[PDB]
Design a protein around this nucleic acid. Sequence first.
DNA 1: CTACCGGATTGC
DNA 2: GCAATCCGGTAG
Length: 210
Amino acid sequence: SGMACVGRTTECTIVPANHFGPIPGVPVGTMWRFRVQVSESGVHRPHVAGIHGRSNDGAYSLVLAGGYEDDVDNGNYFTYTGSGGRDLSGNKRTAGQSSDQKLTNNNRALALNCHSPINEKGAEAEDWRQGKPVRVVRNMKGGKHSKYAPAEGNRYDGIYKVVKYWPERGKSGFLVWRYLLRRDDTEPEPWTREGKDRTRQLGLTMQYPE
DNA sequence: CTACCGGATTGC
DNA sequence: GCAATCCGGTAG
């Protein structure tokens, strides 16, 4: 049973659900054992899903949890995969790819973060820094392939921005939507020495549920 | 490597 | 609204 089925004990209200950018008083480096806790913070509100966004506005946050084999993670930037293209009948939450992904819902949302007009064929922004920001969280299950994944739980790695997005056939040979994200943040990367020394200077530790 | 639940959010 | 979506978590 454990945390498989818990709701939030609390809701971040200090900003609303459609906040782009950092959540005040939640520094880069903050760690949480479980996803529900990350939601409570306001950093990444969806319980389960990879991306938080609205398809007419943008994506606010996302998570690297190694659920999608087409994710490739490079620390300072990375290539994320859109959701969907899966059959979840049977009240499932994850499956392997069984059909082509679509430029809709969160995939559309995240496409809108990119400083260039929405294009059903994908696009790049030349001035990508001027795009709408995305809170990036990394979870310990990216560790199988990524050396940037934390040993446990979830960690907040700061703001990144969608350099470009395009559709393409993934390792499974179904179409997937891919997004190139790149870091633009005021604090160091939690995995670096400097980033690590900063965690310590802030005295951040793993937060567990009360 | 399987199976599947409550709860959070958005789509429309 | 209310139906559809889901990068968890925990059992086996």
